[PDB]
Amino acid sequence: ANYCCAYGEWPTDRFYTLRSVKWEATSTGWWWKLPDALNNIGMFGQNVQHHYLYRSGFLIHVQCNATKFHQGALLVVAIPEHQRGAHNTTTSPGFDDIMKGEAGGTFNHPYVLDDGTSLACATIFPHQWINLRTNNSATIVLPWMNAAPMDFPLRHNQWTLAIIPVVPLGTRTMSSMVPITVSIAPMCCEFN
Amino acid sequence: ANYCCAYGEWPTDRFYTLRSVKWEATSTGWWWKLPDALNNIGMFGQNVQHHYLYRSGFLIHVQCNATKFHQGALLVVAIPEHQRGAHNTTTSPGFDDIMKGEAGGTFNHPYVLDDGTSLACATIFPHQWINLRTNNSATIVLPWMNAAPMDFPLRHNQWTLAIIPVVPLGTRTMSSMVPITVSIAPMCCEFN
Amino acid sequence: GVPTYLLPGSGQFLTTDDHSSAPVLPCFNPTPEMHIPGQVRNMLEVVQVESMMEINNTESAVGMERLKVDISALTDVDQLLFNIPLDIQLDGPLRNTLVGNISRYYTHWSGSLEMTFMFCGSFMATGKLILCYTPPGGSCPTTRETAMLGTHIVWDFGLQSSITLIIPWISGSHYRMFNNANVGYVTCFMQTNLIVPSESSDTCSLIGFIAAKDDFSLRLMRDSPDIGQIDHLHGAEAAYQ
Amino acid sequence: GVPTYLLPGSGQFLTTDDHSSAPVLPCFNPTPEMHIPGQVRNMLEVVQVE
Amino acid sequence: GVPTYLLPGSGQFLTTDDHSSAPVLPCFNPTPEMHIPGQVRNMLEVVQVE
Amino acid sequence: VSETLVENFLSRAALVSKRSFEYKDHTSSTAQTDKNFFKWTINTRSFVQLRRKLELFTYLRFDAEITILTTVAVNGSNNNTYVGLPDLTLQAMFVPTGALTPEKQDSFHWQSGSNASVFFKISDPPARMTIPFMCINSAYSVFYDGFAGFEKTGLYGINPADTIGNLCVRIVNEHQPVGFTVTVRVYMKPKHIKAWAPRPPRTLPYMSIANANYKG
Amino acid sequence: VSETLVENFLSRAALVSKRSFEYKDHTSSTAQTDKNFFKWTINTRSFVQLRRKLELFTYLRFDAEITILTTVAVNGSNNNTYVGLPDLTLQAMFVPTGALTPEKQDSFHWQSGSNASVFFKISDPPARMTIPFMCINSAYSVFYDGFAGFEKTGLYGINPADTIGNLCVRIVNEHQPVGFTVTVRVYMKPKHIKAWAPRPPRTLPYMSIANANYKG
């Protein structure tokens, strides 16, 4: 339903549905590294384990379950090669806090995207808007996005799907709760 | 009636008539800065106040009321970007004595045009001659005369209309008096 | 065999010149280029992408809380919701946008900007706003009736959720550029109160975006003052050792 | 690859010469020129004014 | 007669360059080459041998 | 009839600046802002002859060609043995308007990639570069009948436009044990000249560079 | 509209290294690894301005043009008689990745035929050579969201690809009886630039060269 096709281009229907995240009035955001997630869980994971080279392009679907009395705005942005940095330290981020798996991570400085850039200019990336008064879903298609025809899924993440609440969720009762569901479907399913 | 069209070119009929000036046997001259005058007095002034950019080209008409027993010669010259200097001082002229409004100013050194140039070579500018034995009127049309397509009327004067008596007015009685009337009509009346 | 004479300015190193150079390591074939999706050839298409503005101009606001302005049930009719000075190369709402960051790399800019506002309240929230634009020569209005004298648009966000207004063509260099600002303002006033159902939240938020149109131009590239030369970064002698 | 020899008077600065110069700040487009009314191309038409 | 100016990197010896050289002992005809059986023009056919 | 064209009439190379600066290693903090470098804002009112020749038209449009000829003289002190004049390299940087001008010989502004620079040696043909037409308007305003700023304090006759830029010249070499005197001679020659609205010539010798005041 | 192209936006020559080394005959074993030669790995993160300008696209493909401008200053000691600055020849060797970098001024690696070298004199126009695109991938990775090695110890953000190579500069001449100070200034200018996937600019000044850490 009115998907965003990233950069102008167009390259099996498994749609691995991740566990829903809890959107509160104090949430900062969530992110998933696409090759890091979606593996070791399904047939895509077993193929990624059995092969050194894999092909992708993905298909992201994000859904929100909210009533007509809920308000808030969500920015769904896919960042290519989102190399994130640490905070108040010169050491590099480690494997444990870079590779979060299917659980994913949470932003601690969403205003700078944990990189030092600006969240305001994040719209330059392929993105969609979720305003809980006009729409409650967003679909993004992604390209290959690599400098080389081959890469190693276990060591390099191609895309980073980020969901950041620009406008905090609100209702008359301050116990608001809206679940967000993310579904990822690899495309062309090539593994060699 | 046989107007001077300045430089060869050709680009509403309000004809704001200024107060007449008194031409004596000891007069030195008069000058008006065209955007400086003609504003804050009429609809052109209100448009200039309401807009930062304005378009012009003007239409100058000068008339003299003299009998057949009067003698004298008048040089009506329009000077583009007449930046005038001070006398016996290194300081620059001020806003108060540069912007004289619709009243206009008077030359104190007409032989050098208050600039340090020569009044003899002032005929290189668009000009007309008023000899009180052949004609008593002069009409001058002006072009846009600016380096940029836009300018600020409140801060920059485009033209300077100067009237200098080369031959002093004379009659048998030394109480001579001839009034000079100046009428200015903006052209195309554009304000944006 | 060919008689020649040297010209003035020969054997000088000019940092901005286009001369062919001797190819070190010739007969080496670089890796052939393939199609990487998404390619920018002109920086103009970068600034034609909408970016969030820091509408909330209060100095107390920091972080994400300065990206939105709050319309409360006690905001009261006839109150200035926000004021946006229209000056790209100036600290303010547009300083941290894409258009501002790219324009800070150049000296002369000219073109028309487009501004979009999105209402992010409840589905049943209703109200009206007045969006006023003032030309570069003028003063920002303070009250509703003097705001209504100039060009304005009444935005009923009960039905519409987004409003777009196009700033007319403007040349920043002529208008000042260290004339030695006031290039224009965009203001918002509350025409009515904010009406929300009891179950919904009594506070709604507004966000704004800015982008350049296809007539935007930039000239005379300079050095951006955004980030200053750090004396020395952490790992700097590794390249030399 | 081209054998050349320097001529007398090479590497001299002659104040009256017409030689192309290296354009500082290339790829910079100057402001396009518009029609300003009244243009003098020859000084002769200046002296033909009384 | 031809106005020229020297470019940066002139009069430098680059060990990897393809420029014609002055032939010492010109007008000397080398021994004409005959057909020697077995000739390698590309190193690739060398590595294609088991 | 070709000799009296405006291009031939105005396109004559003229000396526009003849400043000299010291080079020795100033251990003490003295002679500030001119320790080892020379700065000059590109204008045409410095020399009376060229100023009067240019002040015959209201509007001008031209490209300035800059030739920098520099000579070194033996430091007029210390040992007189003529060991020679070492090949000192110089850096001439053109700073267009709206950019930052260096304040000292070792400032970081000398390394900016935005400002175009020319490196040349003392024993080479003089450096030469041509500055294009760099005005926001369609032509330069020799005369300006207006005030620069929107405040009443704005100076009369100064156009915020024009102001081609600044020229900065320094000695790249780190202070040798023996100092030297460097004389910098820069010549400007307008090219592709276009002129509008001729004006009467100027009598009554100039009293200032900023304005057109006279002593009558 | 041609001024705002990516080629014109990124193809500006910028100073990337300004190291200087001593030359005198060190009879004693001191100042190791920098006795008479200068080594620099070709990167772009050294200077903040160029690093921020480059860190606007995810992928880049360009050829680097290197200009080496060197000046010699009188040794700040011993006799002050300005006998002159002798014409010292220099050797600049480009060592691509996967090759051996010299460790001393007199190592045999300076004579290798595989590494391309440039010999130039101190009193000549500055040396200039252009390095082609030398990555195994189709483009350079400004940002790399991955770990280099297959072991978990591999550093984050460092791509085993890219790594254009090293630049080594030395004084070919055998130690003169009097030493000297040599300043090496090298300028890099990308050419034939292609860019992909533009990125938001960088606020929050850099805290390191290896990573993208911030102080928020």
Short mmCIF file of N, CA, C and O in Angstrom, two decimals, chain A residues 28-83:
data_model
loop_
_atom_site.label_atom_id
_atom_site.label_comp_id
_atom_site.label_asym_id
_atom_site.label_seq_id
_atom_site.Cartn_x
_atom_site.Cartn_y
_atom_site.Cartn_z
N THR A 28 12.83 6.20 22.95
CA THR A 28 13.79 6.96 22.15
C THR A 28 13.90 6.46 20.72
O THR A 28 14.09 7.26 19.80
N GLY A 29 13.79 5.16 20.50
CA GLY A 29 13.87 4.61 19.17
C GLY A 29 14.41 3.20 19.19
O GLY A 29 14.87 2.69 20.21
N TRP A 30 14.33 2.55 18.03
CA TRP A 30 14.81 1.19 17.85
C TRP A 30 15.51 1.09 16.50
O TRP A 30 15.17 1.80 15.56
N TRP A 31 16.49 0.19 16.42
CA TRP A 31 17.19 -0.05 15.17
C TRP A 31 17.51 -1.53 15.03
O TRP A 31 17.70 -2.24 16.03
N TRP A 32 17.57 -1.99 13.79
CA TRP A 32 17.93 -3.36 13.45
C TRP A 32 18.91 -3.34 12.29
O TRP A 32 18.65 -2.69 11.27
N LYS A 33 20.03 -4.04 12.44
CA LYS A 33 20.94 -4.24 11.32
C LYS A 33 20.44 -5.41 10.49
O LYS A 33 20.31 -6.53 10.99
N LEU A 34 20.15 -5.15 9.21
CA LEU A 34 19.34 -6.09 8.44
C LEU A 34 20.02 -7.45 8.25
O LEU A 34 19.37 -8.47 8.53
N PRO A 35 21.27 -7.54 7.78
CA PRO A 35 21.90 -8.87 7.75
C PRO A 35 22.16 -9.45 9.13
O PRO A 35 22.11 -10.67 9.30
N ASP A 36 22.46 -8.60 10.12
CA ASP A 36 22.70 -9.08 11.47
C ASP A 36 21.45 -9.75 12.02
O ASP A 36 21.49 -10.89 12.51
N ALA A 37 20.32 -9.05 11.97
CA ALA A 37 19.04 -9.69 12.24
C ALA A 37 18.69 -10.59 11.06
O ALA A 37 19.45 -10.73 10.10
N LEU A 38 17.53 -11.24 11.15
CA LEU A 38 16.95 -12.03 10.07
C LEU A 38 17.76 -13.29 9.77
O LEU A 38 17.32 -14.11 8.96
N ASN A 39 18.91 -13.48 10.40
CA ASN A 39 19.68 -14.71 10.26
C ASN A 39 19.72 -15.44 11.60
O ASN A 39 19.33 -14.90 12.63
N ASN A 40 20.19 -16.68 11.55
CA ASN A 40 20.21 -17.64 12.66
C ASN A 40 18.82 -17.92 13.23
O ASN A 40 18.70 -18.56 14.28
N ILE A 41 17.76 -17.47 12.55
CA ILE A 41 16.40 -17.67 12.99
C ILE A 41 15.60 -18.54 12.02
O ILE A 41 14.74 -19.32 12.44
N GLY A 42 15.87 -18.42 10.72
CA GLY A 42 15.08 -19.13 9.73
C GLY A 42 15.87 -19.80 8.63
O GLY A 42 17.07 -20.09 8.77
N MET A 43 15.19 -20.08 7.51
CA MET A 43 15.87 -20.65 6.35
C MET A 43 16.89 -19.67 5.78
O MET A 43 17.95 -20.09 5.29
N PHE A 44 16.60 -18.37 5.83
CA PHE A 44 17.60 -17.38 5.46
C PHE A 44 18.83 -17.50 6.35
O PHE A 44 19.97 -17.41 5.88
N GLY A 45 18.62 -17.69 7.65
CA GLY A 45 19.74 -17.85 8.56
C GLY A 45 20.56 -19.09 8.26
O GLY A 45 21.79 -19.06 8.29
N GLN A 46 19.88 -20.21 7.99
CA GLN A 46 20.61 -21.44 7.67
C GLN A 46 21.39 -21.30 6.37
O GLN A 46 22.53 -21.76 6.26
N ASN A 47 20.80 -20.64 5.36
CA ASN A 47 21.54 -20.38 4.12
C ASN A 47 22.73 -19.47 4.36
O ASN A 47 23.81 -19.68 3.78
N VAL A 48 22.56 -18.44 5.19
CA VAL A 48 23.66 -17.53 5.48
C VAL A 48 24.78 -18.26 6.21
O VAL A 48 25.97 -18.01 5.96
N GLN A 49 24.43 -19.19 7.10
CA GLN A 49 25.43 -20.02 7.75
C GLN A 49 26.13 -20.96 6.78
O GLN A 49 27.34 -21.18 6.91
N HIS A 50 25.40 -21.52 5.82
CA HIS A 50 25.98 -22.47 4.88
C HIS A 50 26.72 -21.82 3.72
O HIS A 50 27.41 -22.52 2.97
N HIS A 51 26.60 -20.50 3.54
CA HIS A 51 27.23 -19.83 2.41
C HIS A 51 28.07 -18.66 2.89
O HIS A 51 27.72 -17.98 3.87
N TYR A 52 29.18 -18.42 2.19
CA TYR A 52 30.00 -17.24 2.43
C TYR A 52 29.50 -16.00 1.69
O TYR A 52 29.81 -14.88 2.11
N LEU A 53 28.74 -16.18 0.62
CA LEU A 53 28.20 -15.08 -0.18
C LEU A 53 26.69 -15.23 -0.25
O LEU A 53 26.18 -16.34 -0.41
N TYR A 54 25.99 -14.11 -0.14
CA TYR A 54 24.53 -14.08 -0.14
C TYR A 54 24.06 -12.82 -0.86
O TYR A 54 24.79 -11.82 -0.95
N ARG A 55 22.83 -12.86 -1.37
CA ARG A 55 22.25 -11.74 -2.09
C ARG A 55 20.91 -11.39 -1.47
O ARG A 55 20.20 -12.25 -0.96
N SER A 56 20.56 -10.11 -1.53
CA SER A 56 19.47 -9.56 -0.73
C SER A 56 18.83 -8.40 -1.48
O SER A 56 18.94 -8.29 -2.71
N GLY A 57 18.16 -7.54 -0.73
CA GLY A 57 17.43 -6.40 -1.23
C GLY A 57 16.24 -6.13 -0.33
O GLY A 57 15.75 -5.00 -0.27
N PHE A 58 15.80 -7.16 0.39
CA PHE A 58 14.88 -7.02 1.51
C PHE A 58 13.54 -6.37 1.16
O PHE A 58 13.34 -5.90 0.04
N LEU A 59 12.62 -6.38 2.12
CA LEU A 59 11.34 -5.69 1.96
C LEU A 59 10.81 -5.46 3.36
O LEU A 59 10.44 -6.41 4.05
N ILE A 60 10.77 -4.20 3.79
CA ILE A 60 10.45 -3.84 5.16
C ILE A 60 9.00 -3.39 5.23
O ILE A 60 8.55 -2.59 4.40
N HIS A 61 8.27 -3.91 6.21
CA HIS A 61 6.91 -3.48 6.49
C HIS A 61 6.79 -3.19 7.98
O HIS A 61 7.12 -4.05 8.81
N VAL A 62 6.32 -2.00 8.32
CA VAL A 62 6.19 -1.55 9.70
C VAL A 62 4.73 -1.21 9.94
O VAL A 62 4.11 -0.48 9.15
N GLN A 63 4.17 -1.73 11.03
CA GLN A 63 2.77 -1.53 11.36
C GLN A 63 2.64 -1.04 12.80
O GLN A 63 3.40 -1.43 13.68
N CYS A 64 1.66 -0.17 13.02
CA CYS A 64 1.33 0.34 14.34
C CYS A 64 -0.14 0.07 14.63
O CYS A 64 -0.99 0.28 13.76
N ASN A 65 -0.43 -0.39 15.84
CA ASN A 65 -1.79 -0.68 16.27
C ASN A 65 -2.19 0.39 17.29
O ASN A 65 -1.88 0.28 18.48
N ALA A 66 -2.87 1.42 16.82
CA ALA A 66 -3.31 2.52 17.66
C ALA A 66 -4.75 2.88 17.33
O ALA A 66 -5.22 2.66 16.22
N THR A 67 -5.44 3.44 18.33
CA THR A 67 -6.81 3.88 18.15
C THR A 67 -6.84 5.29 17.57
O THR A 67 -5.80 5.91 17.31
N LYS A 68 -8.05 5.81 17.37
CA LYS A 68 -8.21 7.17 16.87
C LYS A 68 -7.92 8.23 17.93
O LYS A 68 -7.81 9.41 17.59
N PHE A 69 -7.79 7.84 19.20
CA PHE A 69 -7.49 8.77 20.27
C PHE A 69 -6.00 8.88 20.55
O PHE A 69 -5.60 9.62 21.46
N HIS A 70 -5.16 8.15 19.82
CA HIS A 70 -3.72 8.22 19.99
C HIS A 70 -3.12 9.26 19.04
O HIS A 70 -3.66 9.54 17.97
N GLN A 71 -2.00 9.83 19.46
CA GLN A 71 -1.29 10.82 18.67
C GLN A 71 0.21 10.55 18.74
O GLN A 71 0.70 10.01 19.74
N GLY A 72 0.91 10.92 17.69
CA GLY A 72 2.35 10.73 17.62
C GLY A 72 2.80 10.56 16.19
O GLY A 72 2.04 10.17 15.31
N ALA A 73 4.07 10.85 15.96
CA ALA A 73 4.68 10.74 14.64
C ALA A 73 5.91 9.85 14.71
O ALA A 73 6.72 9.96 15.64
N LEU A 74 6.04 8.97 13.73
CA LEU A 74 7.14 8.01 13.67
C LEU A 74 7.91 8.22 12.38
O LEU A 74 7.31 8.37 11.31
N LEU A 75 9.23 8.24 12.47
CA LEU A 75 10.11 8.34 11.31
C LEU A 75 10.77 6.99 11.10
O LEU A 75 11.57 6.55 11.93
N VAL A 76 10.43 6.33 9.99
CA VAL A 76 11.02 5.05 9.63
C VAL A 76 12.03 5.32 8.53
O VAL A 76 11.67 5.71 7.42
N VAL A 77 13.31 5.11 8.83
CA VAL A 77 14.40 5.46 7.93
C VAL A 77 15.36 4.28 7.84
O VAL A 77 15.71 3.67 8.85
N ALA A 78 15.76 3.95 6.61
CA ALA A 78 16.76 2.91 6.37
C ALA A 78 18.08 3.59 6.01
O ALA A 78 18.15 4.30 5.00
N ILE A 79 19.10 3.35 6.81
CA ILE A 79 20.39 4.02 6.67
C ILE A 79 21.38 3.03 6.07
O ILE A 79 21.60 1.96 6.67
N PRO A 80 22.00 3.33 4.93
CA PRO A 80 23.01 2.43 4.37
C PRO A 80 24.36 2.65 5.04
O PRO A 80 24.83 3.78 5.16
N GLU A 81 24.98 1.55 5.48
CA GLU A 81 26.29 1.58 6.13
C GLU A 81 26.31 2.54 7.31
O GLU A 81 27.17 3.42 7.41
N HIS A 82 25.36 2.36 8.21
CA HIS A 82 25.25 3.22 9.39
C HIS A 82 26.32 2.80 10.40
O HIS A 82 26.07 1.99 11.30
N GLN A 83 27.51 3.36 10.25
CA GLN A 83 28.59 3.12 11.20
C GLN A 83 28.36 4.01 12.41
O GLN A 83 28.51 5.24 12.33
#
